[PDB]
Design a protein around this ligand. Sequence first.
Ligand SMILES: O=c1ccn([C@@H]2O[C@H](COP(=O)(O)OP(=O)(O)O[C@H]3O[C@H](CO)[C@H](O)[C@H](O)[C@H]3O)[C@@H](O)[C@H]2O)c(=O)[nH]1
Ligand SMILES: O=c1ccn([C@@H]2O[C@H](COP(=O)(O)OP(=O)(O)O[C@H]3O[C@H](CO)[C@H](O)[C@H](O)[C@H]3O)[C@@H](O)[C@H]2O)c(=O)[nH]1
Ligand SMILES: [Ca+2]
Ligand SMILES: [Ca+2]
Ligand SMILES: [Cl-]
Ligand SMILES: [Cl-]
Ligand SMILES: [Cl-]
Ligand SMILES: [Cl-]
Ligand SMILES: [Cl-]
Ligand SMILES: [Cl-]
Ligand code: NA
Lengths: 520, 518
Amino acid sequence: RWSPESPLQAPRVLIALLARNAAHALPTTLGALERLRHPRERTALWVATDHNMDNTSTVLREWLVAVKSLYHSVEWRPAEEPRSYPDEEGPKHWSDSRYEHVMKLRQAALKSARDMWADYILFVDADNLILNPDTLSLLIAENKTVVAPMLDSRAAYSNFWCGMTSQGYYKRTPAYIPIRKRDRRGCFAVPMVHSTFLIDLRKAASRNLAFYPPHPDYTWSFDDIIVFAFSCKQAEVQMYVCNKEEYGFLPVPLRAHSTLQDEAESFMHVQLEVMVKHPPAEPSRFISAPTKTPDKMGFDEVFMINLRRRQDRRERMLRALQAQEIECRLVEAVDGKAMNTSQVEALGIQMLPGYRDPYHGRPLTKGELGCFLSHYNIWKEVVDRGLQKSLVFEDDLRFEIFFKRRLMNLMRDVEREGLDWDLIYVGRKRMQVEHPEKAVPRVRNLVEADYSYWTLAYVISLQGARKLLAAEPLSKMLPVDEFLPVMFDKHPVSEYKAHFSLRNLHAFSVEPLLIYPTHY
Amino acid sequence: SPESPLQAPRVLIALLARNAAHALPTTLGALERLRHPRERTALWVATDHNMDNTSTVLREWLVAVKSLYHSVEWRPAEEPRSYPDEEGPKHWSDSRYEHVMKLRQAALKSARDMWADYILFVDADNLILNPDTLSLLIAENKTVVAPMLDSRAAYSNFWCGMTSQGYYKRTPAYIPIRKRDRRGCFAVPMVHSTFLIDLRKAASRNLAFYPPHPDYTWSFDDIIVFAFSCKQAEVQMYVCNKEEYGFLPVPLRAHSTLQDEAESFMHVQLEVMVKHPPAEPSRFISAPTKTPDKMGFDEVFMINLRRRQDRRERMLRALQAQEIECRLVEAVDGKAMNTSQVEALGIQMLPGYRDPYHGRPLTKGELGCFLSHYNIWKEVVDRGLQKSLVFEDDLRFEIFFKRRLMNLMRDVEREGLDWDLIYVGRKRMQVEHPEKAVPRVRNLVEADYSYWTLAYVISLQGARKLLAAEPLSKMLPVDEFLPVMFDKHPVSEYKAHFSLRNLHAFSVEPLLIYPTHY
Ligand SMILES: O=c1ccn([C@@H]2O[C@H](COP(=O)(O)OP(=O)(O)O[C@H]3O[C@H](CO)[C@H](O)[C@H](O)[C@H]3O)[C@@H](O)[C@H]2O)c(=O)[nH]1
Ligand SMILES: O=c1ccn([C@@H]2O[C@H](COP(=O)(O)OP(=O)(O)O[C@H]3O[C@H](CO)[C@H](O)[C@H](O)[C@H]3O)[C@@H](O)[C@H]2O)c(=O)[nH]1
Ligand SMILES: [Ca+2]
Ligand SMILES: [Ca+2]
Ligand SMILES: [Cl-]
Ligand SMILES: [Cl-]
Ligand SMILES: [Cl-]
Ligand SMILES: [Cl-]
Ligand SMILES: [Cl-]
Ligand SMILES: [Cl-]
Ligand code: NA
């Protein structure tokens, strides 16, 4: 008698989470873990927290109380005091006592996973955003003993090394950049993975892995990720990292003497990166992130040019600003194509005679016409309202880490040196690279702007806005990203600089650039 | 870059023990020796309503083995020692049925809560000889599968039919499965006692030992409730008989006794030693020492060729387990006698005998076999042994052999019966009609034509009658010489050579001893 058997239940996974000073990330992080597409009855939670200066243990307690019932079992290990290690130089410093405790904690979770007869233990760092809900399944599918998903960061940094130095140090190899950029996809044998990775406790070799104490043959630095990575060579467990698709993101780790506000803003920049091509990462339905309140960053006005039909750029940029606690006046761009040639003459507009595209030798486009007129209207509004220092934004740009603090301090430095300035490039395309641009003395992170090529974001002074309107550019219309290099007299073509008599613009660029385009 | 092997699946062995002290050294010994990794095994043990030291045996075993297993759960309950609504230790009152169903549901919840792959139920008196039974059952990849355990009778731990009312039902499938005629894993409506549940299967979630299913309307019986639970879960119960897995005592009536159980499980140990080495106990439990006696006979003999050590040790083991003590009579090797030593004894064959099957004359083995029985006959007369019991060395003891044989001799001597010979093991030849009953003495018949010498009781008056005929001059095979002496041999030529055939011979009925190999 043939009789069909019912399906096998999903593998049993223990999600082990260590949390110290992570209240900034838990709404986005724990919310992602809830929504993992793995049956919660085949999932268990293991949570350890201590040495907190923020309200990390409170947020965890409330999340766990909220989801305790959906899971197979929950383990809760808080420790309110002490709030910091007796041998630390700061919270972002990795002392040996901190290295030891975290090693003991991951061993504790590992033993905890073994004792409950789980199939897998998945480690997730508290600021590791596992955006893809299928990540756990895809990692279980590769059938590796220790496999990790390649999480994306703002820099080359990711949760894996391609080389190692026979003394445990990091090592570049030709394979890193290809894997990191998803040019080669697959699951690659690597000497080091960390942050988030999946251990398959079904494999016999997993019985020989340990996070603490180090292997008897260990002879390297007291460093948690090195100790575990060495446990894998001795167990002959090969570590793998996969990038076959996107899984999640993570912030670049700070230095020892970094602050918590550094870390908080770093994870906020992670949320920005996600929004470059994804919807904003949603929080848990039981945890709320604290209300933020924006400001103008000390400028007199913050503009953002946006064409009304570009709705999604608008919503993205306003989300990107809200999270940075930045507020702006939205300025509706002039649709150049919507201008019949009658309305073009009604404003006295004529192209700069004999203008050709620097790459296709073509005339001024209706699109560039509207772009110029949008900035021109902002210059007109600057003079009307007498705005001393205004910040101008276009609507398709990605922000650097610590954008607000880094910009507010250059303005404070420029002011304390009383620098006579008209225009400060916050984002541009530096066309003069063969020798460094002339550093501006006494003002850190500021150079004299040579030939540039964009208008993504700049700071304009009321003096500068007068100098630009003064040139009467409407009659000699030129792409605004070239009208400016003409005005600070660094444009290459001399024929163009002839049509403008008084080219007296003090133009400086922020160095390095704080704003880049989304698409490149 | 190769991946390491997967660990063995995770099994929880659930063990409900009540009044099992007679079995646990043997049963637990079998379990602790299963070929399946101990780290991939967990123990769940619950005991209560004990009248024997079951609690102490399990505790003694658990304390020893605890440190080798993934986990040990342990649920003892010393008081009360018996159910308030019971009629005896072998009575299954509703309170017992309810408590047992709850303990199995308790184990099923335990196996689930600990993320086990399988829960294995083994009753405390189920002997799992085959160490591969657990691995073999896991391999069949079923959701509820039981190994077919062997019993002394047609009983086993499965049914082939179940009525619309939940009652047992015979089908033509049962006997071939039971005898290992068909060897597979067969879908059946009932398995119990020892079976394996696959907790990896989504359907195993719907299984429950207690409470009964909402649609349940049958008797408040534990095995029925679980069987109906699989039905509602659309889980097919299977039983496999591909090889031998283990043995199992036949259950007893409600008004049965603890000693009936202890001796009935000893018969499993006996049935095991028929074709296997004896079933060893756990190396962490000591079995209770046994004090052998003589059963009231003046002597108990056991004929054994000195060369046949295998037979000797087996019989000695079988006798010790039954608390019976014997006098080993080294047999007479009829083949080792050169013709001159045959003549020294003055032995002539009965002129004309030929085997009723292949027609050969009397053999050398049949000679020494007669001389061994003959030499014991002399020793009964020598020592004045009123009643003695004679054993050969290749015979299979029935259940309750000791008490049943003692009780017969007791009814015999109470009725003052003029007896000479009592077959305990034989081959009955007259089978057309029943042999004659001996009034006022149950389980005893006047022996007609018989044809074996496995086991028999003999009296001093009988030992004299045999030696009186002086058979060494007219020697038949010893098993034909007796039906001559009590005047039933079909060959009147053979009965002619014996002038006086006055022997009073009887037979236990049914027989208490049978041959091992046929
Ligand atoms: O005393 C502590 C220190 C850290 N953590 C937790 O352990 C994880 C460490 O995260 P961090 O952001 O603080 O660490 P980094 O971003 O600096 O990157 C880390 O990546 C590895 C983590 O897998 C190693 O911890 C490595 O030493 C370290 O550089 C976090 O989940 C943190 O919350 C604790 O529970 N208790
Ligand atoms: O109060 C109790 C009653 C019983 N048991 C245990 O239950 C198992 C089965 O009981 P028995 O072996 O004494 O009874 P049976 O030999 O007759 O076989 C059983 O066959 C099925 C096996 O489950 C059913 O349990 C059925 O009720 C019962 O007859 C035994 O291991 C016994 O130790 C307990 O632990 N506590
Ligand atoms: Ca981190
Ligand atoms: Ca039984
Ligand atoms: Cl420093
Ligand atoms: Cl310092
Ligand atoms: Cl320093
Ligand atoms: Cl114990
Ligand atoms: Cl049979
Ligand atoms: Cl039955
Ligand atoms: Na420092």
